[PDB]
Amino acid sequence: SKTRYYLEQCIPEMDDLVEKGLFTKNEVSLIMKKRTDFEHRLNSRGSSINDYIKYINYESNVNKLRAKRCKRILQVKKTNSLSDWSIQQRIGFIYQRGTNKFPQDLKFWAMYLNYMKARGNQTSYKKIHNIYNQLLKLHPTNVDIWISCAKYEYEVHANFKSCRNIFQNGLRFNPDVPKLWYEYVKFELNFITKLINRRKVMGLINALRGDIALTIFDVCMKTLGKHYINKHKSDSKMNIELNKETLNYLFSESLRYIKLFERDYLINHVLQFWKNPELYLKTVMIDITLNIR
């Protein structure tokens, strides 16, 4: 029934394809045979993402062969017909059905995003945002997809306000992930350097920033300490040993922030917040090497 309807919707561009002088009826029938096979393997049960992916790959190769065939046999790159956006919308529809049915497979999600980004000349920006809102509502606790949507937004379209709101939402959902905190600090630093260089070229033709990065660092340390305590919340010696372990973990992460790193002022305020045994020795070593730098 459903398979029947989907092949009926497949037919009209097949008829236009054989109508123009490129594909013969026997090749059309072979293509329709493979389409019947794939549509039934999607509309039965037990089906999975690998059968979806085989369908998408076959469809993309059909589109590529049609491109070579049209360029060969009638030397027109763009024929005013139905066939072009027919095959493109059929691939988009297979991706839509796959992400409706199987919302667990991040590889299929990422292939969807890769396809919709790669056809960027035709892609609805709104469609990219709809797929991203869908994926974020389904998986809130994936800092990889949070980072990736923020990175696409700031790297292609470069809407720093949108990237800011994205990062604040992601940190509201996952205030536990030092990787996401790290990436927020890195994005803020890159935005500051871009603003500084734009000021430089403007003045060339004709500590607030470190402070915001460092307040982000301060609240990072606060919430990471709270979360490493609450993850495994006992007595005096046990609580004290857990306190030492938490402080060790937090300040190892701050050393990673130093390695990420007005560099002198940044390390200065970091060690200022630090002070306000062996870690103390490493800190005064950082002081001496800062005076060397």
């Binding site: 199987f102 919302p103 509502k137 939402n169 959902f173 495994h232």
Partner: protein, 166 residues
């Protein structure tokens, strides 16, 4: 008009979107109760739109104690603020479905454009959700609900009884 509903689980919160409002006068009928029971019809009645798990056992304990008291925890605020569209707060408020009449007003005082329904029709939808359980999540939720139940129950009961070490 029951547009979204919110279900709370020991591994986190979930927000479903209603596809079809079941009819409201025939609710005591054998056909409508058996459509609650059958998974061939509850798929037509309810689709999942979002799911956010808890982060650790301690936050699960604190959030379950906070649901038991009936206040709005931070994770609940986060999921609702992500999912619910900001419509107008005077004309056509959005309609959430809730198991707890007491939980309702805190949701309203937090978000002023949400109307929280706990009627027998919302109890019917939530009962169907709780019945079909793990099958509704399409594969997302890891962790087994039974072990989560036992751990969270022992921890919450021990906290409420104020157990000791001596």
């Amino acid at each position: 008009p029951i547009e979204y509903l919110l279900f709370e689980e020991p591994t986190g919160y979930a927000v479903f979107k209603v596809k079809l409002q079941q009819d409201d006068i025939g609710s005591r009928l054998k056909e409508v109760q058996e459509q609650i029971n059958d998974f061939g019809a509850f798929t037509k009645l309810i689709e999942l739109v979002s799911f956010a798990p808890f982060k650790g056992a301690a936050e699960a304990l604190e959030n379950a104690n906070d649901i038991s008291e009936g206040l709005v925890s931070e994770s609940l605020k986060a999921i609702l603020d992500l999912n619910l569209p900001k419509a107008s707060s005077k004309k056509k408020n959005i309609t959430l479905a809730i198991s707890d009449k007491n939980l309702g007003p805190s949701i309203k005082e937090e978000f002023p454009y949400v109307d929280c329904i706990s009627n027998e029709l919302a109890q019917d939808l939530i009962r169907g959700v709780r019945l079909h359980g793990e099958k509704l999540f399409k594969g997302l939720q890891s962790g087994d609900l039974e072990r989560a139940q036992l751990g969270l129950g022992h921890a919450y009961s021990r906290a409420k009884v104020k157990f000791s070490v001596q």
